Amino acid sequence: MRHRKSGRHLSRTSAHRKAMFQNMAVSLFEHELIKTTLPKAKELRRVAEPLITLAKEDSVANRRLAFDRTRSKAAVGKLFNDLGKRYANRPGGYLRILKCGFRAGDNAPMAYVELVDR
């Protein structure tokens, strides 16, 4: 019925869905522009920004909290050294989503995700 319920299923089981948004984020903090699907971009913007907010405070406890939800050395190295310092005076709203046509094979509406200053 979902009155006032938030979050969408995307027809994947919950262990898949956890381990896919961990993997779209870890590729966004390498290339800084991703051509992805439009409902998968509307829910990427609720996973990626508590990584950028977290990066603004360096700590051994924060670098362990960061590693334990985007489990990669290179993404933790890319935060805390470049990002978090570049967005040091931005009160939220770190990304943007630009709709861009449709997929050829299906009609899946696409979107770009892009960091805001680059």
Binding site: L33, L98, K99, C100, G101, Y112, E114
Partner: protein
């Protein structure tokens, strides 16, 4: 279940009268004079007069 009599030319064509098409979201880019869909990135990669890709 199956039918008992077949459907004529009239009652077959009446069914598919509600099945037409629509495409109306076309918009002209102010700068480059290129045509694209409203609220979408143009195929040369311009959104509201700014190169993004």
């Amino acid at each position: 279940a199956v039918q008992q009599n077949k459907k004529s030319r009239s009652a077959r064509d009446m069914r598919r009268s509600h099945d037409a098409l629509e495409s109306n979201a076309l918009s002209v880019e102010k700068s480059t004079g290129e045509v694209h869909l409203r609220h979408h990135v143009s195929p040369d990669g311009f959104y509201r007069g700014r190169k993004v890709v």
